[PDB]
Amino acid sequence: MGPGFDFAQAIMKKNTVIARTEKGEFTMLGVYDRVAVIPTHASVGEIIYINDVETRVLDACALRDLTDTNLEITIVKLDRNQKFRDIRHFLPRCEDDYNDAVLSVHTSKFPNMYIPVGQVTNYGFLNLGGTPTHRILMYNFPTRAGQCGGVVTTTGKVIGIHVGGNGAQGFAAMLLHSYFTD
Ligand SMILES: COC(=O)[C@@]1(c2ccc(C)cc2)CCNC1
């Protein structure tokens, strides 16, 4: 409808795949080369399905901060025959608050779904499904099962991936530029 949906649309059409693990179907954001992210609760193994194709996982790393606290981001390198568009220049360098964010989901159950979630708070600590977690963003939208891995963007920035909710608020793990240096 507007530049918010304009930005989200392009990230979705070129930088997302549908990932299936034993724990379900997730929106998976491709960041650069064969490197993508997914919520750690997807429990990525040695093999994953990417758009229903059997794919070997070459590496997978569940990120934690330097206090050894969960961040709920897993970085996956896929044995795929094609590279993602490099979107690392759209990642923020620091923890921040944001205005006017969109949460975008693409699965079998929710294809081409875009939700204007509005203001995003740097919430910080969250007890997420019993697991102490850091760098959580929060938005006041009643997000539901099947939105996990969903991409959170503002005009010009890719700021997080959806990892949970409480029925009234949704929670995303921050993406930071420093996660993807090489
Ligand atoms: C991923 O986003 C993009 O590449 C585009 C974009 C870039 C920046 C802003 C503020 C809006 C839209 C350029 C082409 N159409 C979407």
H helices of the chain, in order, are: 3-15
Measured from the CB, is residue 97 less than 6 Å from ligand 1? no
CA distance 92 to 20: 28
For the chain, give every domain's residue range.
Answer: 1-15+85-182, 16-84
Give, for ligand 1, the residue of 1, 5, 6 to mutate: max count of ligand atoms closer than 8 Å to Cβ.
6
Ligand 1 in reach of 47 Cβ (< 6 A): no
The residue whose CA is least distant from atom 16 of ligand 1 is 7
- Round the CA-based radius of gyration of the chain to a whole number and report it: 15
Which residues neighbour 156 within 8 Å (Cβ) at sequence distance 6 or greater?
Answer: 7, 90
Q: What is the resolution of this structure in A?
A: 1.6
Approach to solving: X-ray
Q: CA–CA separation, 165 vs 140, rounded Å?
A: 10
- Catalytic residue among 25, 134, 148, 162, which? 148
Taking residue 103's Cβ as centre, other Cβ atoms within 10 Å add up to 25
The amino acid occupying position 141 is: F
Beta-ladder partners of 77? 35, 59
Is 148 a residue of the active site?
yes
CB of residue 6 inside a 6 A radius of ligand 1: yes
Output the CA 7–ligand 1 centroid distance in Å: 5
Confirm whether 94 is a catalytic residue. no
How many Å apart are CA 160 and CA 116, to the nearest integer?
A: 14
Among the listed residues 73, 106, 83, 96, the one whose alpha carbon sits nearest the alpha carbon of residue 157: 96
**Strand ranges (E), the chain:** 16-21, 24-32, 35-39, 47-50, 53-64, 70-78, 98-105, 113-128, 131-139, 151-154, 157-165, 170-174
